[PDB]
Amino acid sequence: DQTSYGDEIDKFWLTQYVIHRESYDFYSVQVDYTAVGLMSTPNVAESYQSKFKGRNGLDKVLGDSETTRVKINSVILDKPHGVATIRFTTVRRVRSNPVDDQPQRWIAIMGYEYKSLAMNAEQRYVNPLGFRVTSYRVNPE
Amino acid sequence: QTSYGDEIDKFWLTQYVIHRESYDFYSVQVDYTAVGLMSTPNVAESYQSKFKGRNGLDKVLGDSETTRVKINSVILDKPHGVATIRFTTVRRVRSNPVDDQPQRWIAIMGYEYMNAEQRYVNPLGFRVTSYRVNPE
Numbered sequence: 130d131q132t133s134y135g136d137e138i139d140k141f142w143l144t145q146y147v148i149h150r151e152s153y154d155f156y157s158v159q160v161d162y163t164a165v166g167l168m169s170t171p172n173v174a175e176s177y178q179s180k181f182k183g184r185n186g187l188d189k190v191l192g193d194s195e196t197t198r199v200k201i202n203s204v205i206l207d208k209p210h211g212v213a214t215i216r217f218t219t220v221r222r223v224r225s226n227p228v229d230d231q232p233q234r235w236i237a238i239m240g241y242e243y244k245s246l247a248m249n250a251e252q253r254y255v256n257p258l259g260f261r262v263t264s265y266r267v268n269p270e
Numbered sequence: 271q272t273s274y275g276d277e278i279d280k281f282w283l284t285q286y287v288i289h290r291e292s293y294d295f296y297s298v299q300v301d302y303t304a305v306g307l308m309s310t311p312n313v314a315e316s317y318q319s320k321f322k323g324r325n326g327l328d329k330v331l332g333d334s335e336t337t338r339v340k341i342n343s344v345i346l347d348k349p350h351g352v353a354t355i356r357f358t359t360v361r362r363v364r365s366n367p368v369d370d371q372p373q374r375w376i377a378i379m380g381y382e383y384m385n386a387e388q389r390y391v392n393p394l395g396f397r398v399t400s401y402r403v404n405p406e
């Protein structure tokens with residue numbers, strides 16, 4: 130239960146979180162979805178999970194008709210406050226389309242912490258340190 | 271535990287190479303310490319031997335030059351706790367106005383899984399047990 134663990138460590142989990150959360154590939158969608166659950170408070174997770182509920186669930190709607198890859202451009206930390214700012218670029222590619230869509234740049238404001246939580250054998254292989262996000266907001270530049 | 275995930279194993283290794291193969295007079299001792307914390311004494315002493323004694327690398331190069339690392343690719347062999355990484359180094363002599371020409375290398379590694387200081391750098395007890403670098 131330490132808010133910070135090391136700039137290089139904190140930087141890693143956060144980048145992994147965005148890529149899990151903002152990228153779309155039907156392969157490893159479940160592990161992404163699963164990971165975010167472990168890497169989020171219920172309040173933050175509920176806001177993310179909503180896109181997968183009902184017959185309209187993003188996985189059941191798009192499937193493999195399109196994809197979205199993520200590229201981390203920069204990472205800014207506020208270590209003592211458990212706050213970080215990230216800029217990344219998403220590029221979508223629809224197989225229906227001949228070429229990838231124009232890029233989209235974004236800014237992610239995050240609150241984060243690590244927590245002392247008793248865990249099973251499965252929850253660790255994705256999140257060994259109990260890293261979980263407590264705030265999340267995406268905006269353009 | 272025994273199993274920790276691929277992208278994480280990829281992380282510790284690349285940053286370890288950067289810790290071990292990069293040269294920057296600042297943070298040497300911590301990096302030197304960190305690599306020490308991140309390594310078994312037997313394989314680390316091979317890394318320490320070149321930094322200990324009157325012949326110490328830090329006392330030869332000092333702050334006259336630097337060497338940075340750039341990761342190109344990473345491949346894992348999980349069940350054996352073995353991994354291979356490929357990187358490119360660019361050296362810079364402070365006296366020279368520009369940077370030296372690049373050189374690429376391959377690192378072969380073996381790996382496996384506290385007070386206040388040992389946790390914050392490694393929380394997992396991740397330790398390196400073997401290390402060998404070769405050219406392409």
Ligand SMILES: O=C(O)c1ccnc(Cl)c1
Nearest residue numbers: 149150151152153161197
């Ligand atoms: O299409 C997206 O960018 C996207 C949106 C919401 N969740 C995921 Cl995993 C991917």
